[PDB]
Structure formats: C-alpha cells, structure tokens
Symmetry: D2
Subunit: 414 residues, 4 copies
C-alpha cells in the first residue's frame, strides 16, 4: 500500500522495499532527487536508480549485463560521477618490460582494440635489446586561459602592458599563489582580440593534473586584476586559450602539462629480427607518413602513427581524464640512421602537451591506483612534489615510442 | 605441492605448481597461454607471475579480474590480459532528440560531468526537443604509394580521376565485402608520392578493418595497371586516423552530423541561470574568437570531447578516436519574436562510430548500446543503428555545450 | 589673372570648352571652396595625366612635407588602361626593379623568368638554382588540377533545412539545375563537383570551375550569383548572407586550399647529379636532405604551419606575380608549397628534388595583365593573353613556370643553408 | 665597325680605356663567345643603364618573340640605388599604379595612405572606409609588441643533450651570456625572452629583438650567429644545421607568428555611428555583425584557417607594402588579422570594429625603402627613414597606419557584402 509506506520513512529507509520506494516515485509522493541521501547503503541507491531507469527504456532487460554489485561507490559518489547505474569493465593488458631511464616498467593498457597491446609489447622488446630508452621532462605547467573584456582595445592594451611589467605580474602572482600550496605562477602569456584579452595562467600543480587548482588560482587572480581595472568584465573563466580538450596550436607550441622527449637506438640486427624490416625502410615510412603525410592532411601536432592509441589505453588504466587525449597525443616521431655503419635506427618522440597526474580525479579510485602502483607512481611523491606525475608522463612518452616503433615496422614490412 | 617432473593436463595442476614450473625454468612462461584451459585462470597466473617482478608485489590487489567474460576479449580485443578496469557509468536524460527520448550512458571519472550534461538535456526538453540530420557517412583509409617520378604519380592521379579508371578500382574495393561501396576518391600528390583517400560506407561497423581490406585489394588492382608503383604504407596518415587533421574537418570522416534546438528565454533563466544575450557573447568570444587565438583547427566548442569520450567508453567504441570525433563547432544565435530565445546548434563532421565489432561485441558495452536501441546491426536498413548513435552523440554534445556554456556565462 | 569662381564655372559648363580652357590653378581654386569635389576630377579633365597632375598638387598641400611626392614618377605612363579598371585616385606609379633568372629548363623548353623585387640577391640565388637544373638535364612539371573557387555563405531557417539543401545539391538532378545556371553566365563556366559544409543553419558552398586563361574571380563570382538565384527559386526562405563567406578561400591562409586546391595545382621535379651539387651549389646531397627534413618538414611542423613546408616559395611567387601583372595579395595562398628532397642515383649522391604547389592563383588575361609593361613579361615566357587553340594553356604554362622557378629558388637557398653561411 | 675578339679584350682590361671605348655589338660578341660572363656586365660597364640595355639585347634574341620587351620601360630610371643592393640581372622596371586613400583619421592625426595596386575598386573601397572612420570620430591604435625573430635549428648527439641546452638557455645566467653575445653585434640588438622547442635531438631557438626602424632580418641573423657561437663554447658537440629552421617563421604561414607575434603586433579600433553606417556604407550595424560572425569567424573556421579571420587584410597590406618599399613576399604573415564587430553606444545601434594584426613585418630603412619613389610614399606618411631621437618610432607608426588602413578596408568590403549586388 501507499500511505503506510510514507510513515515508515519518518520514523529509516532501510525498512522499506525496492518496489515500495519506487511505489513512492512512479506515484509522486516523494520527489526524485532526494533518494540520494535517504538511503544509507551506496549499492542500494544504485540498484534503485537502475530500476527507475529501467521503466523508461523500451528494452529494460538491457541493464542485466551492465555490472554494478561489489564495487566501491564510496570514492565515486560526490567526486567522480553522478546518476550512477554501475560500471564499465575495460580489458587491461600489459606491455613490458619497458626499459626507460635505467629502470624497467610493466605498463598497463586499458583497450578493446585487438593486437594493440601485443604490438606495443614487441616495441618494448626492441627497445630493451637496444639498451633501453632515455627521456626528459622539458617543461611542466597546467594552464587555464580565460577571456576578459574591457571597454576598448586601448584599455586592454594597457592592461596587457601592465601584466608584462615586473610589478604587475608580481601582484597577480601573489593572488594566484595564495589559493593553494602548489599554486606557483610562471610567466603569463596574453593575446588581444580587439577589446578582448586572453590570459594564459601556467603553474605546476604537484602530482595532480591540476585543473581544480589552476582554476581557483585563476579566479582569485582575475579578482585582483578587477580591483586594478574595475571596468573589466570577466567573460569566461575559460576562453578556450588554455586550451583544454580541444585541438590547438598553442598547446603544441607553448606546451601544456608535461612537455616530454624520448629516444632510443635500435641495433640493425634487432630491427631485422624482432621488427622484421630494415632501418632504411623505417625512415622511408616515417618521413613519408608521419611528416609528409600528416602535412598533406593539414595536421597540427599529429606527426605520429598512433600515439593516441597508447595515451588513451594508459589514461583509462591509470585514472586519467581520457578526454584530454585530444591534446595529450600531440606527438612528432623522428627517425634517422645511426651508429658506425649507419645501419642502426635512432628513434625519438616529442610530446609537448601531456596532461597527467597521480592524485585527484580517477586516481582516487582503488582499481586505477592498482595500475599506478604497478608503475610505482601512485599518489603524491612525498619528498619531491610532482615527480610521480613527471615519471608517469615519461612512461607514456616511452610507451608511445614503443608503439610507434612497432606499428611503423609492421607498416614498412607489409 | 608435488615435484616438478610429476606434473609434466593443466587443470589437474595447482597454481603454485605452474609457478614453480616457470621459476625452475622447466617450462617457458609464454607456453602457458596455450596449455592452460580456462581463460580466467590464465589471467590469474599471469597476474601472479607479474606481481613478483614489481617493486610492490601487492600492487594488483585491487585491480579486479574475476567473473568477467574473457572469451570475447582473448584473440579479439586485448592481449597479455591481467584483469579489467571499472569505469563508473552515469546516465544523462531524457535527451529529447528527433521525437524520441534517449537515456544516455556516460563512462567517466570527472565529477559533475554527467550532472552538467543532464541539466542540458532538461533545458532542451523544455525547449521542445532537438533535431538532427546525418549529412554524410564514409569511413576512410589513406595509404601512400610511390612512383619512380612525380610525372608517373601524376599519371596515376589522372587515371583514378577518369570514370573508367575509378570504375575498376571501385569493383576491386567493393568485391571484398557486402557493405564496401566506394564513394569519390580524394588524392594529393607530394612529389612522386601519392596519398589516396578511400572513402566508403561500412554498414553499422566503424569500418577500420573493412575499409583496409578493400584498400589492399584496390591497390593490388592499381598495381596491375602500374607495375612500378610501390605501396609504401597502407596508411600514409591521409585518412586521417587518430591524429588532428584539417582533412577530417573539411571532408568529414565517418558520420557528419548536425544538431539544433531553441531554448525559450524563460528556460534559459530558470534552468540555465543566465540569458540568451550572455550565452551568445560567451560563445562568440570563447568558441570562435578564443579558439581562433589559440590556433584551433576544428575545436570551436567548449568540451565536446568530454561527452564523446564518456559515451565512447560506455558504448564500446575506440576511445582513441575522440581526437577526431570530438571535432565540433557550436553556434549560438538570438531567435524568436523579440530575440530572447536561444537558437543553438552543433556540427560534428567526423564522428567515428559503430555498433558492431570491437568493444561493441562485449556484453556490458552491448547493454549501453541496447539502452539507446542501437546495439548490433540493422538488417532492414544497414548502417541505421550506427547513424542513430552518431545523432545521439551530437545531441548529447549539444546538451553538454548548452549546460557548460550557461555556467560560464553566469 | 585666375578669374573668379563664377566665371570659371561658366567655362566649365560651356560644352565646347570645359576644363581644357582652365588653368591648373583655376581648377584647384574651384576645388578649394567646393564646386568640384575631387572624385569628379577624373571625369572632368581633358586627359588622364592632367587629372593625376592636379590630384598630386591638391594632395601636396595636405602633407606636412609638401615636396614628399617629388620622386614619385607619374608622367609618360599609359593611364588609359588603368583608369576605371586597375586603380583609383591615382597619383603616379611605383617602379619595381625587374631582374631575370634563367634559362629555366622546364619540359624540354627554356624560359627566361622575370622577377620584380627589391630583395638583394634573390634573383641571383634563383638564377643559380636555374643553372643547377640546366646542367642536371632539366626539370619536368605537371598541372594536376585547375579550378578557381568562390565560397558564398547562405542561411536557411533551420539546420534541418540547410541539410535538405545540402542533400538536394548532392543529387545529380539538383546539381544539374545549378550547373546549368552557373554555366550560362560565361563561356568558360563549367561547374565541377560541388563542395558544401554546414555550420548549423549556415551552408557554405564552394563553387569551383575553370576560367580559360583568366584567374577567374569575377567570372566565378558572377556564375555564383546566378547559381544562387536558381537555388532560391527551389528554396524561397534561403538568405544569401555573403557572396564570399571565406570558404573559397581567397587571400587568407586556409587548409581547404591546401587540401582541395584552388586555381592550378602543380608539381615540379628534377634530378641534380652529384657533380652539379658540388660545383654549382657548393654542397652535398646528404647535407641538402638533412636541412630539408629538419627545416622544411620538422621545423615547419614545430612552427604549426599549414601549407608552409618550404624555404621561401613566397619570394619567387611574389616576384613573378608583380612582374607578370598578377594580384600580389594572392601570394598568401599561391605560395603554398612542400619541398621534398631524397638521395638517388649512383652513390646516393644525386639529389632528387620536387615542389608541389596545390593552389597557384594565376591568369594571363584580366586585371594587371591588361597593362603593356606586365604584358611584356608575359610575352617573355610566351604566355601573354588567351590561347585560342587550347583555352587555359597560357595560364597553365605560367603556373608550371612559377612552380619550376620556386624549385630553383628552393635548390639555391637550401644549398646556402647546408654550407653554414 | 665590328672588331675582332683579341682587340676587344685588351681595351676592356686597359684601365684608362675600358668598356666605354667598345660598342654594343662588341660586348655582346664577347658574352656569346664566352670571354666574359653575363652577370659581370654589372661591374664592367660605365653606365648602369647601358648594362641594362645590353642585358635586354642579349635576352631578346633568346626569346621566341624578339620584340617582347618593347613596352617594358627601363630608360631614365635611377639604377644606382638598385645595383648591388635590391636586384640583379636588371632588364628594366615594372610600374605599379599608385593611389591615395584618405584622410585616414588615426590617433588624432590624418594620413594620406599610398597603395600600389592593379586591382580595380580596391583604392575606392578603402577610401570609403576611411570616410566612414573619419565621420565616426576617427580611429585609435596601440602597438602591443615589437620584435623581429630568427629561428635556427641546431643539433646535439642526443635528445637528452638538447634538453640540457634548453634548460641552460632557460636559466637567468645562461640567457645573460647569450644576450651579451647577441647584443655585441649592433647597438639596436636588445634580445628579448628566448622561445625554444625540441624535436628529438633537434633544437629550434627563436631569437627575438627590436631592430630600430629596420625590419631587421640581417641585424637579427648576425646577432644570432654570434649568440650561437657563444652557445657552442658551452656546448661544443652542438652543430648548427641551418641559420633558419623555419621556426622564425619567415614568409610561410605559421601558428607561432599568430600566437607569439613577429615584428609589430598592433591593434586598431573605431566606433562608427549608426547614421554613417547607413549613409556612407549602405547597410546597418546589425547586418554587418551577422556577416562578420558568419564569414570572418565561422567561415574562416570551416575553411581551416589559422590567422585568416578577416575579409581582405592582404589586399591593403600588399598595396601599401609595394608602395612603401617593403618586402611584399612578407604579406604571408603580415596579413594575419582577426576582424571583430559589435553593437555599441546608448541604443546598441552603433558599430564597434577592431582589427588585430599580431605579425606586421615592416621597416622604414633598408631594402626597397632606400629607393626614392618608395621613399616618396614614406614621406607622405611622415615615416621615411630612421627616427633620430626615438629609434623604432617610424616603423611603429607605419605598422599602426597599416592596421588602421586594413580596418578601413574591412569596414568597406564587409558593408558591400552585407548589402548585396
Ligand atoms: C597496432 C594495431 C593493432 C595495428 C596493427 S599491428 O599491430 O601492427 N598488426 C600487425 C599485423 O597483425 C594485426 C596487428 C596494424 C597493421 C596491420 C597489418 C599491417 C601493418 C599494420 C594496424 C593497421 C594500421 C593501418 C591500417 F591501414 C590497417 C591496420 N593496426 C591498427 C592501428 C590503428 O589503431 C591506428 C592506425 O590506423 C593509425 C595510422 O597508422 O594511420
Ligand atoms: C561540466 C564540468 C563538470 C564543469 C563545470 S560545471 O559542471 O558546469 N560546474 C557548474 C557548477 O559548479 C561545479 C561544476 C565547470 C564550471 C565550474 C564553475 C563555473 C562554471 C563552470 C567546469 C569548469 C570549466 C572551466 C573552468 F575554467 C573551470 C571549471 N567544468 C569542467 C569542464 C572541463 O572538463 C572542460 C573545460 O576545461 C573546457 C573549457 O571550457 O575550456
Ligand atoms: C635568397 C636570399 C637573397 C637569401 C640568401 S642567399 O641568396 O642564399 N645569400 C647567399 C650569401 O650571400 C647573401 C645572400 C640567404 C643566405 C645568406 C647566408 C647564408 C645562407 C643563406 C638568405 C638568408 C636566409 C635565412 C637566414 F636566416 C638568413 C639569410 N636569404 C634570404 C631569404 C629570405 O628572404 C627567406 C628566408 O628567410 C626563408 C627562410 O629560410 O626562413
Ligand atoms: C574591394 C574590391 C574591389 C571588391 C569589392 S567592392 O570594392 O566592395 N566593390 C564595390 C561595388 O563595386 C564592385 C567593387 C567587392 C564586392 C563586389 C560586390 C559586392 C560586394 C563586394 C569584391 C568582391 C568580394 C567578394 C566577391 F565574391 C566578389 C567580389 N571585391 C574584391 C575583393 C577581393 O579582392 C577579396 C575577396 O575575394 C576576399 C573575400 O571576401 O573572400
């Protein structure tokens, strides 16, 4: 019945049944947003929402093979996802060992693309027999790129010139750096479009990817700049100048997050025996595919075979924002002849905008932390903040370089 | 635990028996892939062998692996498998698109994304619904061939542009499959190089493998007319697959889609907490001027990648294709009698998508496709489930654009 | 002695006298204190040179330094072909030095290439690259495509309506109706397959067609206006927003020109024996390829270039354009070029080079090519005017010559950079 | 009259006689029998004009039409400032019509802008845009940045070593040493913040610096060669591969110039009253915002443009550049412009407009600005030559005039398109 169920809620929600909580929502006694709190167990809230969603689907038995039980919804509710109806298993494979900077790495890769892990693994094997890869973090700084307007272009020119002064920058740094412990503002980058002004705030973020933090610092820095210029309107805390989750030449040219380089020398014997091609044939494909080919297609930053495959697989496995694959896959793969008789293959990848972290986001979840622990970069680095995030970026660049090696070889062979 | 020589089928052995067999070097580790009978147990032993090689051997404790269908994953989706990664799934809906109502699954770990998208759907719902059209459909592969001279590569270009030359190439390409039907070829020469862009429908598949087999067969036929042509690479980055490229933005790849909606001024005020005037000002100066100042090709939107990515992971798509599939331009305009209502549209020229093959063969991913009524192939109208899913992506993206842009305007 | 204003007006209105019977000072006296505005000088004065003379005198009194114009020449120039066709408010002309680089050994022919420039060493450097190609057995070129474009933006009431128009233009019957209208406007109007693009309820339509030997912009614009008039008959609520919506794309950087082409798409190539690379270019083939890979491909890529995969194609393109009466502002798109270099021949010491230029926007008729001095430069190359026996052949030959000269420019600059100063 | 070869050579190598004593036919005979090289005519002949005459005569009998140079003028031109400076193998000169658009009301001053062009209606269009600006209270402009660049490519044995070099250049003390070596080559050389980028073992270094009133390419390249020599002392395994690795980026389309700027970054603006938009421009404010949005922004975006969010900035840039002795090949990057338009004033019926041009590559000394006709146009604008008491001020002013004139030509072309016809 209806009105007797109503009273039991006032006196806990554990004493009702599934059907009786949705006898009170299909008939509208209680409204359909308060379910969140009333129920005490997290997994029962998900069950109820699956049953409510069930009623609206033409095929309600769809949900049966979408799993949901035995998952830790405590770290997900109010942090990583809303309207949660379960989870989506992504098969994880391992490619390694990856000999990178004198260590070995077993790299997890969440994908449903056949042969991708097997290909990457072969690439790691070739790198290993050639003495391993070396890599460097060239730069580190997440950004946010708001757009403010002033009454005139002459005004925004004066605000820009004031920001490029020592005194102006320092007042904006103080406001930015007071919001957070890792908020340390580097040189600004501005651009005028008439009376519009786009300001690129850049800062290291510890081991976090850093968008929450960079945003808070940006908001306070715009508030201080508003005191200094009261006529200034703050249009959008992001004006696409960052640039987050969209292709942009500013990320390719200035960097965003970690800028990283990676290299390796593959002996001629190893190129023939493992990779089934030659050094000549590899350089010929790299030149005419990754350079000339991408050039004919009108690419900015896409001078690689399939960096996006590897970045995405690692990102999903390691609790990253997979959407940031758009910019994070920016890569240029270079190949040339090397060694005494010019038969060995030098290879390098440069990825100037890897947006990555080992704290926050999906790295708070325990399964994702398992993959980060495989690599030895899980959570913050207590003695050198940001080194875990930098190490993971190095790993992605090296694994990307392994995947470039392997796929390019298979293409050169036929 | 019995001695090594006695155990030398696999089902009758214990875990520690197989492992001590490998560590004593009586049997290579790679030979276990074949010898072990059950797939779940092969994963279990690989995890245990792997764990000892880590500086933290307990690191795989919370990476789950039990009770999952590895029969659809081995030899199809993933290798060297050590488990699975659970991505939380939320629902945004109802999305009121083309007179139907969709409950859209989104696999994400970004807080507030699903909720934000959901508020956008609500706005579109009270605005009467969104409409959408597929404008084009054709996945591509862009191999590169070499001739001895640029004069010879120009010969091949002009030959492929003749109707008789294109006709024999189409015949070869189309013989490889039911759904392989070759539309107009696009070619560019760079010296003695020649980049040929094979475009064709692929039924309800995304069509990577299918277009590739048709491409190999077509290039073989081209080799009969031009024996000195060398196939340098079956992909010469001219497709373009999983890299940012203007060609995808200008010619399209996969499904080209448009979506639109008019939100009443009252709904913008009460649901989205802003005005039409303020939204448009932000759209102009963010998604047009801003993306222009940052040097964007195809990124004239706020966060289309967020929505594309979450849907793709939920629905068994190749999530690495969000690079090109997230290509979007969001327009906003004053509409209505007094210019107070909000016309919004999103154009997505290269949504790379499918509802058969790949990750859409796995059962949980199929559940999400089934929620939307697009799982599997369409017997009556081949390619209609895939087309419908592309329309759903564009419409959810538009709902995401609406909601985020509203929050930024306020 | 300059008569009062009123008496000078009587003379001006006297139809068998007019401005000829007035003094320069009297005309100026009439302009100062109005009666004649200034734009009416061109239509009132006996001869074209006197209008220029008077305009210069008026202008001079408005400047801080009244002798500014002294070394700006204006006399003895054929203003008859310029007034009302090439320029307005004319105060003189700017002489650009014309040098000559050649012979350019192209397709078993020889070309002496004129080059208007004020950049020191440009002609010499280009002339040396010509020498390398000549002693190397010469170069070969092909025109791969031909078709000037125009990209109007139109507007339907809804995105669904613009999609319907897009689909209708894609049917063979709807395309045939717009093709008939487009083609009716001029003798060379032949609409090739259409390219369209939706942005919501906007529809961008790239009309492409050959234009004989004309560059073809006025002609394509006229066919476009007629074609869109026909389209509105089928779609009455379509608004023609602009005849150019920047989808052409004319005189701005744009990836669509690079990918689809605009005007003449062209490729040129040569093989330079090791002997010639040494003696003429002062370097090796290995050095050249090293620079070519890491500057023109990798360097351009790091710079975020679209279509700019070359050393200085724009230097050559600009110098020929100015000499040959082209629109020099179309240097933006016409300079698009990718220069490739690989090892070849005996010890991998011969240099195979090629340039590919997909959007050379050029013509041997119309605009500045109606003027006799820039016609002299076209006559040098044997490409002046229209080709009666083979329409478009003169313009095609000029685009082949531009590509061949760019490659010579590339050869020579790249060799200087491969030496280390 | 024609003499044998041996008798001709003795008189030529005779100091007190020379080529003055030889005739035209005799010098041509020596060049044909290969005694003397053709490029050497520059230095052996007594008159510049006679060298041009003999060059023309040689050229003419190599051509299929021997009279093709008839209307290519060459006599009475001042070849002294050209020879050994601006052009080689000179056979004459190309007159480009010059016209005036103005007054351009910019920063409370008035400018009469010279424009070398052969495109009909361009000057008239631009003049109408000026008229509308002047009636709307004139235009204001600001120079946001000033700094010509050069982007060499160097190489290390490994990417890790080039990462070392990048880190070293980023420290305050490493940059101080490179700055000292750069600044020692000239008094105008003041090195700004260094931009670098790694591609494997390659390293692209963007040296940026003001150049006085010169465009500054030779000044920056010299300072770059000294700075790289100093870098080599600290990093001896470094190889300079090319002094330009296309990272500057000079005369090619590149996002780095759009984003970082090159030479003069400038912004102009104005507010045109609703009355003026109606009467002068034959349209409305609302109609032009709609066209600017869907053409110059959306349209350019659909075309795949980087930096080309404008109507025809390249027309204005090219025209002023040729008239004022600039390198017209540099309109490639210099034309970079985004044109924006909004409603303004108490009733939102007035037109706000702005143009932003981040990479104007310009100068009032060097190259073609040394020639007198080109200098005449510079004197028109009051910017001819080096400014004594405020170095760089003339080139900055000219850049401000170029951005204001572009804005004039944007207003005018955009209004015409918004109206129709
Ligand atoms: C790594 C991946 C599993 C893979 C491989 S593979 O791993 O090397 N291979 C070897 C043979 O057995 C199957 C597995 C290959 C491949 C297949 C045959 C010949 C050469 C290479 C292809 C492949 C690429 C372009 C084609 F046209 C068609 C197939 N792909 C897909 C890559 C794909 O995800 C991005 C790719 O499209 C990016 C690009 O190169 O444009
Ligand atoms: C949808 C998502 C959860 C979201 C939201 S939100 O859902 O709309 N919101 C409203 C209620 O408050 C909590 C969260 C917001 C946001 C937050 C505050 C004000 C306005 C908007 C931001 C956000 C964007 C740019 C910022 F600078 C800082 C925060 N994001 C992140 C989008 C992000 O994933 C791509 C974004 O970077 C793409 C872009 O616009 O450049
Ligand atoms: C052709 C032109 C006359 C020319 C030449 S030159 O003709 O080869 N040279 C030989 C020596 O005597 C002087 C004249 C050179 C040059 C000079 C020294 C070493 C190597 C080459 C340079 C030059 C290029 C890039 C530099 F960084 C610095 C000088 N330029 C300018 C080209 C210029 O207009 C586009 C160029 O910037 C495109 C590019 O390479 O980025
Ligand atoms: C300034 C120039 C002389 C000019 C003018 S004009 O000066 O305004 N006009 C006034 C009326 O008398 C004729 C000349 C026009 C024009 C013509 C008709 C309607 C509106 C404008 C066009 C023109 C533009 C786009 C067309 F599709 C076709 C003609 N052009 C050519 C511009 C051209 O050099 C760059 C242009 O192609 C860049 C672009 O807008 O994409």
């Amino acid at each position: 019945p209806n009105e007797e169920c109503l009273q039991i809620l006032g006196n806990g929600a554990k004493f009702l049944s599934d059907a009786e909580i949705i006898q009170l929502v299909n008939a509208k006694h209680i409204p359909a947003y308060k379910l969140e709190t009333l129920i005490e167990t997290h997994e029962r809230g998900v069950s109820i929402r699956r049953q409510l969603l069930s009623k609206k689907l033409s095929e309600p038995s769809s949900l049966q093979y979408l799993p949901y039980r035995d998952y830790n919804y405590s770290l997900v509710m109010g942090a990583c996802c809303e309207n949660v109806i379960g989870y989506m298993p992504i098969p994880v494979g391992v490619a390694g060992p990856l000999c990178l900077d004198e260590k070995e790495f077993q790299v997890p890769m969440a994908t449903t693309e056949g042969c991708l892990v097997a290909s990457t693994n072969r690439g790691c094997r070739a790198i290993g027999l050639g003495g391993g890869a070396s890599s460097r973090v060239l730069a580190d700084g997440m950004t946010r790129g708001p757009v403010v307007r002033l009454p005139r272009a002459c005004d925004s020119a004066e605000v820009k010139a004031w920001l490029e002064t020592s005194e102006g920058f320092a007042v904006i740094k103080e406001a930015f750096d007071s919001t957070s412990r890792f908020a340390r503002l580097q040189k600004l980058h501005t651009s005028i479009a008439g009376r519009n002004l786009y300001i690129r705030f850049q800062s290291r973020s510890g081991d976090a990817m850093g968008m929450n933090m960079i945003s808070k610092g940006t908001e306070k820095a715009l508030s201080k700049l508003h005191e200094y210029f009261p006529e200034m309107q703050i249009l959008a805390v992001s004006g696409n100048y960052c640039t987050d989750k969209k292709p942009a030449a500013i990320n390719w040219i200035e960097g965003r997050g970690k800028s990283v380089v990676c290299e390796a020398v593959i002996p001629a014997k190893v190129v023939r025996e493992v990779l089934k091609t030659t050094t000549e044939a590899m350089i010929e494909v790299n030149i005419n595919k990754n350079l000339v080919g991408s050039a004919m297609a009108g690419s900015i930053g896409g001078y690689n075979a399939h960096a996006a495959n590897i970045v995405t697989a690692i990102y999903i496995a390691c609790g990253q924002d997979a959407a940031q694959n758009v910019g994070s896959s920016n890569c240029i793969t270079l190949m040339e002849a090397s060694g005494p008789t010019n038969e060995d293959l030098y290879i390098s990848c440069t990825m100037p905008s890897i947006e990555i972290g080992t704290v926050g986001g999906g790295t708070n979840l325990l399964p994702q932390q398992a993959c980060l622990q495989m690599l030895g970069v899980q959570g913050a680095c207590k003695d050198n903040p940001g080194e875990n995030a930098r190490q993971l970026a190095r790993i992605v660049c090296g694994t990307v370089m392994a995947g470039e090696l392997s796929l390019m070889a298979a293409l050169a062979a036929g």
